[PDB]
Amino acid sequence: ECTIVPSNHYGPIPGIPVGTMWRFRVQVSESGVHRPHVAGIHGRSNDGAYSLVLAGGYEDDVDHGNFFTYTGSGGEQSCDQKLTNTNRALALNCFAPINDQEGAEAKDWRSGKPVRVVRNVKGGKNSKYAPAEGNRYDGIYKVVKYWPEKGKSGFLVWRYLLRRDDDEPGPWTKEGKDRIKKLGLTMQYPEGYLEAL
Secondary structure, eight states: OOOSSOTTOOSOOTTOOTTOEESSHHHHHHHTSSOOSSOSEEEETTTEEEEEEESSOSTTOOBOSSEEEEEOOOOOOOSOOOSOHHHHHHHHHSSSOOOTTTOEEOTTGGGSOOEEEEEEGGGGGTOTTSOSSSEEEEEEEEEEEEEEEEOTTSSEEEEEEEEEOOSSOOTTSHHHHHHHHHTTOOOBOOTTTTTOO
16 A cells, blocks of 8 residues: 555655556556556545546547546446546546536636546557556546536436646657656566566
8 A cells, every 4th residue: 555645645646757657456556546456536525536547438438648538437337327426526626616417617627636547458449548558657637527428328427528737748749758768667567576477
């Protein structure tokens, strides 16, 4: 468990630059970047969302690197999703009064709470920005807006639009690639995994 910062910490983790890579989720958790071992989003309905992992979207989720659409959890979907638990936590980051009927949009989106975003290899099936292997920290994003809509299953799902707001260049920019090289960042493996093979 990460101790350099509390579990409800917002923003970048000290010592972990954009571009950092880990082979397994357990390592991502220990670093503090995305604490949950399984859930795709770390958040509390009475505070906000601290981080999320993109591992292949749902329905029509689209990823453009600097911004992407995202889908809530809960609900084979047999019932409507609700703006509770992590769906509510992510909505709370949006700089606008929470609205569980039609959703909301922030005019001053940069004043919203930061979300650390990690992209996982499995998202490679529906996104050109996924890393070729493992998990990669891509920086801070903010929630521009969220809204409910009928999903493929016919039931209601909550949707979100996230946009990047980070001074470290994206790992896909020319600058980002250079920085990653100069910092010597390579895929990190569990201590020992690189001993026994």
